[PDB]
């Protein structure tokens, strides 16, 4: 079987941020675990938010509220800004 990871995307992000720095296999696995953990946390928080308001759907507002509730402070502010930028770019295209 074939396993699914974020290895290529993490490598792309790293090469975009630090062009001249590579990453080891163990560090890439740790980064993949971190991404998976954050994804699960955000998804569970969004599911709880949808359940509380009796809404059968998860929209960008649910994800934004989950980001505010999970990520702390300036990290949450920047994450919300990036998410809003990406959603606007996706809609306008």
């Amino acid at each position: 079987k074939n396993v699914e990871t974020y290895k290529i995307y993490i490598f792309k992000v790293l090469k975009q941020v630090h062009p001249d720095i590579g990453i080891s296999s163990k560090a890439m696995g740790i980064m993949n675990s971190f991404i998976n953990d954050i994804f699960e946390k955000l998804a569970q928080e969004s599911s709880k938010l949808a359940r509380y308001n009796k809404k059968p759907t998860i929209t960008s507002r649910e994800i934004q509220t989950a980001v505010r509730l999970v990520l702390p402070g300036e990290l949450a502010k920047h994450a919300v800004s990036e998410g809003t930028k990406a959603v606007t770019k996706f809609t306008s295209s």
Partner: protein, 80 residues
């Protein structure tokens, strides 16, 4: 509203300490205990307000506070 943290008087902090089994209390404690309390509220009310902002409401309900407490591992029974 302004300066309502002092509304948590020294007798109230003394009573809270006595309920916790404290026999002697230093003079400085009443100050520190206030600040700590404030921090706790800042961690809960914020979360509660977040829920209130997600439901598009302007009234903070008991359910928002209960969910905010549960998010921090501070589950509260009796308001469910």
């Amino acid at each position: 509203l302004r300066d309502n943290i002092q509304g948590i008087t020294k007798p109230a902090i003394r009573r809270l300490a006595r309920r916790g089994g404290v026999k002697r209390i230093s003079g400085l404690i009443y100050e520190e205990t206030r600040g700590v309390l404030k921090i706790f509220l800042e961690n809960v009310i914020r979360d509660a307000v977040t829920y209130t902002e997600h439901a598009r409401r302007k009234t903070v309900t008991a359910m928002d506070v209960v969910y905010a407490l549960k998010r921090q591992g501070r589950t509260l029974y009796g308001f469910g």
